[PDB]
């Protein structure tokens, strides 16, 4: 495998933190959580593709191991379709009306819930939380800068 | 009103006739996508191997 052992040890240590799985295994639905916590930013489509296009019911009746999870993360790191933050900060400007580097939080919540891969109301609230202001607007630039540092 | 109806008849017939031949073009693009999809399936299974 084209992956050093130094970071592999830390990856194994992080994967062993779940525990709640019977033993050294991992569920299909919980695979994305461990894949996104270690690093990278895979999408739902990418997760379903690397997982071999699992069935709807297969996401809760089977479990994988680490020998199969390592190549998944390897491919996600090597092969990816993400992009830098320069394109993200410029994409959110489409919703800016006045053009003063601010956008309404409700519009961002709606765009995140409907447009794209859709997100639950529990996640969008935590995402937009903290950036509350008097005018109810959230600077997309600061939002992207904070999300990139996460 | 009669001129618009007569003019719309040629547009409807032309649009329908043009759309008929355009279906083959759209099908050709879909056929190329389906043919290219075979490579994706081979590449997807290849990555799994």
């Amino acid at each position: 495998c084209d992956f050093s052992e130094e970071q592999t040890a830390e990856f194994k240590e992080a994967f062993q933190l779940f525990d709640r799985t019977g033993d050294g295994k991992i569920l299909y639905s919980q695979c994305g959580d461990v894949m996104r916590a270690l690093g990278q930013n895979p999408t739902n489509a990418e997760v379903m593709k690397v997982l071999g296009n699992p069935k709807s019911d297969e996401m809760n009746l089977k479990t994988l191991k680490f020998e199969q999870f390592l190549p998944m993360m390897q491919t996600i790191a090597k092969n990816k379709d993400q992009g830098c933050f320069e394109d993200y900060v410029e994409g959110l400007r489409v919703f800016d009306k006045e053009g003063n580097g601010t956008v309404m939080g409700a519009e961002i919540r709606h765009v995140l819930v409907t447009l794209g891969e859709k997100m639950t109301e529990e996640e969008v609230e935590q995402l937009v939380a903290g950036h509350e202001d008097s005018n109810g607007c959230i600077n997309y630039e600061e939002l992207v800068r904070m999300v990139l540092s996460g | 009103l009669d001129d618009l109806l007569v003019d719309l008849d040629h547009q409807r017939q032309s649009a329908c006739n043009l759309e008929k031949k355009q279906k083959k073009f759209d099908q050709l693009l879909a056929e190329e996508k389906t043919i290219s999809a075979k490579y994706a399936e081979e590449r997807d299974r290849a990555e799994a191997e």
């Binding site: 309404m104 409700a106 519009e107 709606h110 819930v113 409907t114 | -």
Partner: protein, 98 residues
């Protein structure tokens, strides 16, 4: 003819440019439930069939975007369904704008 076909088929709501038309069904229809309210959550007017929930969502989105107030007015003769329409609008607003 369109109104009759929509009423006899189980469709009391019908759009009309910028204002929706409603017909009193005189019977509790199954077009009112939490699942339907969640389905209409964040959906354009031309994305779901005619329904008071769609008009309410459109008005809410317009108010949140243009920052201008709204008014869900209901006009009709006595016994047309204005009270039920207002009830459903308030229910949708309380379930969505919470």
């Amino acid at each position: 003819h369109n109104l009759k076909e929509r009423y006899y088929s189980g469709l009391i709501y019908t759009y009309s440019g910028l204002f929706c038309v409603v017909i009193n069904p005189y019977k509790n229809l199954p077009i009112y439930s939490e699942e339907i309210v969640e389905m209409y959550k964040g959906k354009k007017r031309h994305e779901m069939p005619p329904h008071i929930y769609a008009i309410t969502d459109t008005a809410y989105r317009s108010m949140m975007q243009d920052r201008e107030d709204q008014s869900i007015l209901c006009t009709g003769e006595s016994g047309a369904g204005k009270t039920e329409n207002t009830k459903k609008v308030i229910q949708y607003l309380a379930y969505v704008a919470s």
